[PDB]
Design a protein around this ligand. Structure first.
Ligand code: FMN
Ligand code: FMN
Ligand code: FMN
Ligand code: FMN
Lengths: 367, 367, 367, 353
């Protein structure tokens, strides 16, 4: 499996261009596994087009200069209001794999979310992170004991938070992977205690198929008790699941449609956020994801009730293209892109963004 | 008439791809008789896009495992909440014709609907049905006795329900058929009793022509008294017709626009179901059709007030590609596809699906 | 100037196809003068797409058979609720010019509207009409005497109503005609008196330029008083103009935007009709035009508050393809087309069309 | 650095202004051509500026007793032939050799107000030549150093500027994808200046520029009505609704969708200049009916400059006037005040209808 191995910074004019550029260095099956989404990919187009439903205003004479993008979340100072989303199998994009990404995230100065379906070990990622804050994302086992072990091992690694992803009890209808009969070209060290024998050669359907299908609120309570760490429930799109999660002991709400890779013919993630934030009414922090590509998106997410956003596909396309330097280039882009938007909207800091007016656009994408 | 005859299962990644796949093997006239719709087919595209007006929510920690797709309608236990739609002249799609389809539907475990314009005899379909349940769909003659005869034969063969298709009192303006100058290349045994000889060589326009134009509610009463069977009234888009049908004695309502093949410049069928369902007010069962293509459209219909759905073009496209096994592949796909959707929306059984929240998308297809 | 001369019936499948088909046998300039409209023709597209804002319901068990398209307007019995709209310079479409169209309309059994910018004389047209009813459409001269003159000639020739086209005090910005430097290849005998020459070699801007710009409500009183005939005011899109015209003695309101050939960046004509019909509140008859192409449109117009529609561009493509007989085929197409629609909508007669429920589509054209 | 703008001077036939964009791409150097035509991000907000005109639609009106409509109007004492003036734009040299002076002469002979950018490729003297006694407003980009502002404003009152336009929506550049991709470097210098422009602009800066210049000040870049309140309160004599032809903030609305709410907050306290997207008489009319007092034209004049110097520019100003004159006739507008009273049709379907 010929993954790219080249390391370097890259010019990021916009993050949409990176998809096509990565398509040229990443193996066909893997690239489309990274890029693709459920069905004819309509709900992924909605993730992207929802950004035009709410439009930013330029603001004049605001007494603003050198905006400060820093913020804080569960006591982690970070350089911008974004973090790295859990993404499986970075190996698919670059030989340095999760360590590559980790090192970029670490040096940028934000949080790395580690995925249960990681291609690399904790040890290999820890050396990439070099003491940087990390949270861990769990896809659960059926067997309770294996869950205690993963959470224990994750804690020993230093994870200061746990992410329950619950939107993937079975796989989404990912036509690209099915037509390419994709199977993972390496193992998943952390979870293979419950695939028992390698993830290599298996499809994402049997992997999700061996994880826990029958997740209940009790699982959120349980994980919080055992881990002793703050718990995010990730994949939420209906506000009712925000109440349920919080009542179950979640310390944060992660709004997300899994980048349209799960339930098809669903709304674009950003359209669900206001309602969810209104229900949460600031009881816990909110991380938002699924379709962020621009600083104008980070702003809009913040203005709409998110505390931070999680970045995914672009950072993977950066990795592919220049390893940890390519990824850092993408993180650096987002900060600078955000820094421009703050200046033109009268935002001195991250709290100002959360308070911005938004122009409602009933006409949508075609205007 | 060079129908395909090859029998086999097929991969089904989605049902849309089947269209182009069938055109390569089904001859020009018959293929376009099956695919196309009235006018420029704007309403057919409406049936497809209506699905994007109400969107599903993913639900999390719903305590759901191995969802059950079985439901019951008018005493029949069926494996999934869908039935086969009455479709004429399956010979256009495949040499095994209505028998092929019958075998698949019966072997899958759901109800077959028999078209009065079937290319095969009642006897030939029975072979195919090997005991499975059937409903009979009548295009009424003008002569009463001939209605009684047909209903009596239908009931003789085993029909447990009669479907009155009342939306075809004259043909829609099917441009593809006018320009191809399409005429049926074999006869219709159940109805030639009222044609100018045999249905072979005739346009659908004159066949409908030979059928009853002046259909009134007295006909619903008459069919039900005579047949002593449940009568569904089919082709309903407007709520008043549903009340009228029920007062006239109908035992179910069948929401349909005939796959856009009749009145042009009308709404997508799905946009009309809620208002019809409110007027029905759970007095009788509702079957929905016209545009179903995914498990998600199956769930959205039940959620909006149907009890089951009817499948059409997709099953025919499959039958063209692999006879009874091609058709079976398609039904199986709709079942697996529904199963995924139930799990992700947090529906343990079919009754849960009818209680689902939908997201209103006022932006429409382009979002 | 090489206009078509062939006379024959034609196969009309839909009226949209006729446009491209007439382009094959009509000289570039004259064709594009017929086909085009103001600006980028966005408002011509709005005229067509507005039909998708209100969608017809099919209705079942309506007890309808052989519907009757006949109707009556200001005491004229006619075979269908449509009339021929006034259009200049028919000789650009066909050698028989306005006499061929007259023959078509008269044989069909509806009303002919004569343009003041006709290229036939009153006697040539009158010959094709062989006694059929006619309405005369005036573009006013600046000089009062010449207005009295034209009306005297129109009443003497048989006209039973006068149509005041008032939406063209100056020309639309018709981009096709400027780029083609289009000018008329023959004279216009009826208005010649107030052009300082012959209409031959003149642009439509300079012709409209000679006509009265300063049309006021007194111009309506005066035409009524002089003619003694019922006066339609034509080009209305704003309800206030309906009040104004009726208050000035108009006996009819003709809703129109000149088939999008005048004011650019304006609504599709059909969207403007309900408001107008409400303000009119049945004080006088309403003719609708500007975009009619199908029987569904005729039904929607009548259901939205029109008594009749007027046909235009497609009748002229008809004339190009087969002179009076091609034209007749189009009228006969509209008659048949509306007949199917009445059958499926449950309309026995023309009055029934006026009471139809329409489904509201807020999603517009892409749905 | 090397720049080879077209130098031919001629009148052109303008059928519509959309066609001028591509026509001018055939005779303007690629880099500079796309500097003028391009916008931020993937230009969705520039497309938004154009499509907004389809949100409100004009009605034809009949028997309005109208003839020879009159497009003249008046703003802060200036009598102008049409309710449009020229927007402030930099680097006219990018379009034509005659640069700002060419545009000046078209604007002057036509009979409306030239607006002069601080970042112009020409001297006040070179521009005054083309202007030939005609009226001018000076648009400032503020420097950090107060003395330079005061010096540039004195200079501008010296040349005869009768208003000052403060442009506050460019505290940092838009994200112009084309310029980055084409590594476009500005080919000439800006002799009215000499980057470190004033980021931290406040209301106090409005007060100060009114107070020193002693001229009417317009605030330019407004898309939020609060900012109209802030401007009038700080002493602005005018409000200039603009998103900078979409060359600035991305993923924002089309300028014309924001106009009504601003007009409503302004309450005719000061006059309103509107811009960003104007391409037809139909748009001048809708801007006016939606609360504007005059519009500013930009890209289409420049494209006319490119194709025919002052005479191309002029052909464009001429086009708008005739185009607007057609619309007035068909809408029942005798004069420019009548346009501000026009009813508009609400189109909730959007561009696709
Ligand atoms: C290739 C890929 C792999 C992913 N793997 C995981 C995973 O293992 N666990 C998880 O919770 N989310 C996973 N996600 C979802 C992301 O955390 C996030 O929700 C998504 O990337 C946001 O969409 P965007 O990247 O298009 O902005 C994955 C997404 C992608 C594209
Ligand atoms: C080729 C074809 C033939 C049909 N023949 C009949 C028929 O004989 N009787 C009837 O009641 N409906 C008939 N229908 C309508 C179907 O019962 C059903 O309404 C339609 O196929 C559903 O739309 P879809 O297939 O596009 O989802 C036919 C539909 C198609 C596409
Ligand atoms: C080529 C052409 C010539 C026309 N000439 C006239 C005319 O002389 N007088 C008039 O009142 N309307 C004229 N009209 C407008 C028609 O009366 C009518 O409003 C229009 O054709 C309806 O639009 P449609 O043809 O797209 O349905 C003309 C329209 C066309 C297309
Ligand atoms: C190439 C270019 C340069 C510009 N330079 C300036 C400038 O220096 N100062 C300023 O206030 N506005 C500037 N603008 C904005 C214009 O004043 C005006 O707001 C814009 O042209 C309106 O967009 P439109 O011409 O596309 O309708 C510029 C616009 C363009 C396209």
């Amino acid at each position: 499996y010929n993954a790219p191995s080249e390391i370097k910074y890259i010019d990021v004019v916009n993050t949409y261009d990176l998809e096509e550029e990565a398509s040229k260095v990443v193996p066909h099956g893997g690239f489309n596994y990274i890029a693709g989404a459920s069905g004819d990919e309509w709900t992924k187009r909605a993730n992207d087009r929802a950004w035009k439903h709410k439009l930013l205003y330029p603001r004049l004479a605001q007494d603003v200069e050198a905006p400060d993008t820093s913020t804080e979340i569960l006591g982690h100072k970070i350089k911008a209001p974004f973090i790295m989303a859990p993404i499986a199998a970075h190996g698919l994009a670059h030989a340095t794999k999760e360590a590559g990404t980790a090192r970029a995230v670490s040096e940028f100065g934000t949080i790395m979310s580690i995925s249960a379906y990681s291609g690399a070990t904790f040890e290999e990622i820890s050396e990439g992170l070099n003491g940087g804050p990390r949270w861990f994302q769990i896809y659960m086992a059926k067997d309770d004991q294996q869950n205690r072990d993963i959470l224990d091992e994750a804690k020993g690694d230093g994870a200061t938070a746990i992410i329950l992803t619950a939107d993937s009890t079975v796989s989404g209808n990912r036509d690209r992977d099915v037509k390419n009969k994709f199977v993972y070209p390496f193992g998943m060290p952390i979870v293979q205690r419950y695939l028992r024998g390698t993830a290599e050669g298996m499809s994402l359907n049997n992997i999700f198929g061996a994880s826990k299908q029958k997740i209940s609120p009790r699982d959120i309570e349980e994980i919080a008790a055992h881990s002793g760490l703050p718990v995010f429930v990730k994949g939420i799109q209906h506000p009712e699941d925000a109440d349920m999660a919080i009542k179950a002991g979640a310390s944060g709400i992660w709004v997300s449609n899994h980048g349209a890779r799960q339930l098809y013919e669903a709304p674009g993630s950003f359209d669900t956020l206001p309602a969810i934030a209104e229900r949460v009414n600031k009881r816990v922090p909110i991380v938002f994801d699924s379709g962020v590509r621009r600083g104008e998106h980070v702003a809009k997410a913040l203005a709409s009730g998110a505390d931070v956003v999680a970045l995914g596909r672009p950072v993977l396309f950066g990795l592919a293209l220049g390893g940890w330097q390519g990824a850092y280039s993408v993180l650096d882009y987002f900060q600078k892109d955000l820094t421009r938007v703050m200046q033109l909207t009268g935002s001195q800091n991250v709290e100002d963004l959360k308070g911005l007016d938004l122009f409602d656009n009933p006409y949508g994408y075609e205007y």
